[PDB]
Amino acid sequence: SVKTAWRTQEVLRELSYTQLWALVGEGHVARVRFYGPEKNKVMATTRASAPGGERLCKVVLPPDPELLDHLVSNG
Amino acid sequence: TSLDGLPETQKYVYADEWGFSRVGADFPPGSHPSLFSQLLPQALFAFDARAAVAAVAVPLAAMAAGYGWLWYMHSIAPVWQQALCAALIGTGYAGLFKVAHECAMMRFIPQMPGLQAALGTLLMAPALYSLPSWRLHHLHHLLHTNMLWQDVWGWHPLTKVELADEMVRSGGSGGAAMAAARLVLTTPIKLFASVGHWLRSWDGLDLRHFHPASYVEVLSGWAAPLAFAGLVLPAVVSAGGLSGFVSCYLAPWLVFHFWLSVLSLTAHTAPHIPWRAEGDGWDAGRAAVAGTVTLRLPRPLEVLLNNANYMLPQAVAPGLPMWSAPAAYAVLAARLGPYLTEASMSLKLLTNHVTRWQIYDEEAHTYRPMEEVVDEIEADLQQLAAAAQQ
Amino acid sequence: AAVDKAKVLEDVRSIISTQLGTELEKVAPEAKFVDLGADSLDTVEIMMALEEKFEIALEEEGAEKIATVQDAADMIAAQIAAKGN
Amino acid sequence: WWREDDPYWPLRDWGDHPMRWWTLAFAAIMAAGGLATSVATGYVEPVQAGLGAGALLALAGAAMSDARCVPGALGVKLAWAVCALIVLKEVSVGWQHKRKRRLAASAPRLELTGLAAAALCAGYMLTDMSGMGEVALPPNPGAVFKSPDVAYRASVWQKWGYGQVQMRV
Amino acid sequence: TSAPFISPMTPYVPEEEPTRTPPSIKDTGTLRPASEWYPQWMQYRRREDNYVFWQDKFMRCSTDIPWAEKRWTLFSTVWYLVQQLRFVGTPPALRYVAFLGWRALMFQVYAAHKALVLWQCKLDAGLARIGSGGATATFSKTMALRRLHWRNSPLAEALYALNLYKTGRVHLLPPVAKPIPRPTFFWLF
Ligand SMILES: CC(C)CCC[C@@H](C)[C@H]1CC[C@H]2[C@@H]3CC=C4C[C@@H](OC(=O)CCC(=O)O)CC[C@]4(C)[C@H]3CC[C@]12C
DSSP states (O other): OOTTSOOOOOOOEEOOSHHHHHHHHTTOEEEEEEESTTSOEEEEEEOTTSTTOSOEEEEEOOOOTTHHHHHHHTO | OOSOSOOHHHHHHHHHHHTBSSOOOOOOSSOOGGGGGGGSOGGGGOOOHHHHHHHHHHHHHHHHHHHHHHHHTTTTSOHHHHHHHHHHHHHHHHHHHHHHHHHHTTOSOSSOHHHHHHHHHHHHGGGTOOHHHHHHHHHHHHHTTTOTTTOTTSOOOOBHHHHHHHHHHHTSSOSHHHHHHHHHTTSGGGGGTHHHHHHHSSOTTOTTSSOGGGHHHHHHHHHHHHHHHHHTHHHHHHHHHHHHHIIIIIHHHHHHHHHHHHHHHHHTOOTTOOOOOTTTTOOHHIIIIITOEEEEOOHHHHHHHTSTTOOSHHHHSTTOOGGGHHHHHHHHHHHSGGGOEEEEOOHHHHHHHHHTOOEEETTTTEEEOHHHHHHHHHHHHHHHHHHTTO | OOBOHHHHHHHHHHHHHHHHOOOTTTOOTTOBTTTTTOOHHHHHHHHHHHHHHHTOOOOHHHHTTOOBHHHHHHHHHHHHHSSOO | OOOSSOSOOTTSOOSSOGGGHHHHHHHHHHHHHHHHHHHHSOOSHHHHHHHHHHHHHHHHHHHTTOTTSSHHHHHHHHHHHHHHHHHHIIIIIOOGGGOOSSSSTTOOOOOSHHHHHHHHHHHHHTTOOOOOTTOSSOOOTTTSTTOSOHHHHHHHHHHHTOTTSOOOO | OOOSSOOOSSOOOOOOOOOSOOOOSSOOSSSSOOOSSOOSGGGGBOGGGTTHHHHHHHIIIIIOOOSSSSOOOTTHHHHHHHHHHHHHSSOHHHHHHHHHHHHHHHHHHHHHHHHHHHHHHHHHHHHHHHHHSSSOOOOOHHHHHHHHTTOOOHHHHHHHHHHHHHHOOTTOOOOOOOOOOOOOOSSOO
């Protein structure tokens, strides 16, 4: 839990590939930046309304042509 | 002693009137307690591992039983079950604390001194007490037993004269110190006044009271309580919240302090035991033999407390180990018989301690209730005001 | 350790004259300060001007009892003399 | 308070460190506030940090009651270390129970605990923290180049790895 | 007393090594700057007595350094870089211009501080009147000079103000402030 630990040195969380999907579906991801020498890593910044507040998460992207429409559809 | 030469009839009516069994006669002056160490058989001083491990293991088992139960039924149990587990844990810890008091006076395991020092430190820490400071205060108590104005590490009584002085300074009986004394020595909270003792240790956290050559040893002594209260009292709270604190630590703590306070208070206070000043008839042997009261408990309680009530024997033979204290007493009761005082722990005794013997007046050299005494000295205040007419 | 008390005296008197506004003939080595027009708050500013000109620090205990020009000169000279040690 | 007979009693050499009651006061404040906060919310870091710092600062303020000894100096060093660590955690990592929903609303900033700890550190430095001055990094071959001692210079060169160099001195 | 053998009537306070070099000989106690090269008092002394100038330079620069200004710690190996920049990486001409500017600034600051000290003298001379309730209106010149040379701690000032406000008694002065020793921690600083 968050209630039983010391706050330590803000870093990037890690989503696998799937809670990213559910999160961007529920309208919670707020901005996405692509990076990686082969352009398959994502740094996603959520919005305040999400469970946990604004955080900075990291996702690894394995080729999926449905991604762009999903993202741009949900603002 | 207060009741000097007089037949057995008045002695025994006083005895059953105050709840004591055998009152005491009168001891000659000019002696010392260390004399009667020659009346003891030499076999009483022998070391054996059996009683040692038994004394360190029985209270540990009682504590573990109480804790296993209490956690098995953490907060779903009603208040009486909580009270009973707290009483059991407090008594077990009073037993382990008696063991630690033995290691402080260097008479538990003398062959391994480092081990007995470490053991005493460990067992004293959970009560937030220091081992070197405890040794010092207890030695100072043994040297000044029942000395008026000097035995500050025991149940020094509230005398009439200082009360009158405070009432003359307060301009009435409504001040802050007044009401403080009023509730502390008139209500059953007196049976916990040992907590005051706890706060007077840590002599201001002031290294300027001690001999310099001992600083490092005293500092270390203070760091074992603190470390506990700095590493373990967090965990408890963090793992159980306020309730999980008040039931796992605070209630056994209050029970342990009940035991400490009642033991000492009954030990050295009674209407027939005077408190002579220094130079005015204070005698060492007379105060350590005649001015002591032995409390008798059920044998289960005794074996749980490691014979913590037997205090007279280890004041005449300070090296006498803990498991030889009952037997040794039986010896002394044969030879010092007519002078000793004894009592059994009953409700009447504690009711008398709370309601009757509250203020010590030295002219009559006895204890009298607080309220009648204060109204009497206030009527004499009115009469000296009338005497202050001109 | 050896101070030209004459030079110190001339410079003290010149500083005093320039501070108060009176002319150098009126400032005599035994003239007190109260008659030259000096009032407490200015027997201090004179001390500050003296220190500022000579670049020294005055001993305060003795500086409480300065009332004539010769005491000023002797204080300053005893300060300048005890400089190395 | 006021003492008409001698008003300047606080500036009198009583035998302890000047910053000795402030240290115990701050320890008490830290402990009380930590326990109160961790009970009022449910977080377990406030009480742990508060009571740890309280224990360490009470021990340091006990040792600081005789400033001439060696423990009298190690006490000051311990107190300074603890207050510096508190200031650091406050201004660089912040506290767990002070997270918000936003990102700039929950940034580590200096509040009132960090400020008190910084004031304490300045007070230790500007009163007396000069003891145990012989603990430093060991001397170089650069410090003993001009020293008048051949045995000492040889010893230092040996320790630093130059035992075979020729001492044309 | 602790002393088993010998104990004078005033207890012995164990004095330790000094931790900082003394103020030079050229400086004053105040804020106003020194004198570029030669002091002014040098002109009122025997030529064979002014050798203390160069002796003081030798003492502060080479021969009396307290072994606490030579500790190697982690803070000092970075201050080394700051100082080496100032001394070897900056041309002396820009340093000279900055020197002139800093001198002018310090003169302005000293003038301000002197004004403030005189103001304080009136204020406390006024406070002693409330204190005594009656006549007393003077002040203490000793305290004025001690304020100008930074010889009072803030606590001493506050206690003096209180003593004035309550009992007049303008001539009862706090003892004096002692110099601050160099702070050391460990290998750290
Ligand atoms: C906070 C809980 C969960 C853990 C246990 C904390 C104890 C280790 C603390 C709290 C109460 C403290 C005591 C409270 C009162 C005092 C008196 C105080 O000194 C004085 O008041 C000196 C005399 C004076 O000020 O006039 C500092 C030491 C002492 C024994 C303190 C020592 C440390 C104690 C026992």
